């Protein structure tokens, strides 16, 4: 271990949730969650878009 | 005109079909025709790839 301070994990301070780009989740392998085109990207959850 | 010779318009005589490359068809201004999840690049006709 070798590290006092917060532990986020057992503390509940999160600081790096912002690193996020984009999160995709498959069931079966074959069909996308967010399906039925719900999303402006309806293949995958967007979080950071830098283009 | 100052062209004789076979007129595609009404000859039925297409050879540059194949320069296409993608089509994006947008019903509504909003959404796109396919629409739901149905091809391998959902939103756009592509028709020719290169890289």
Redesign the interface.
């Known amino acids: 271990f070798t590290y006092s301070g917060t532990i986020p994990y057992l503390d509940g301070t999160f600081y790096l949730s912002h690193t996020f780009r984009k999160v995709a989740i498959q069931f079966d392998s074959s069909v996308?969650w967010p399906?039925?085109?719900r999303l402006l990207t309806?293949?995958e959850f967007e979080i950071k878009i830098s283009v």
Chains 1, 2 share one sequence.
């Open positions: 996308t399906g039925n085109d309806p293949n």
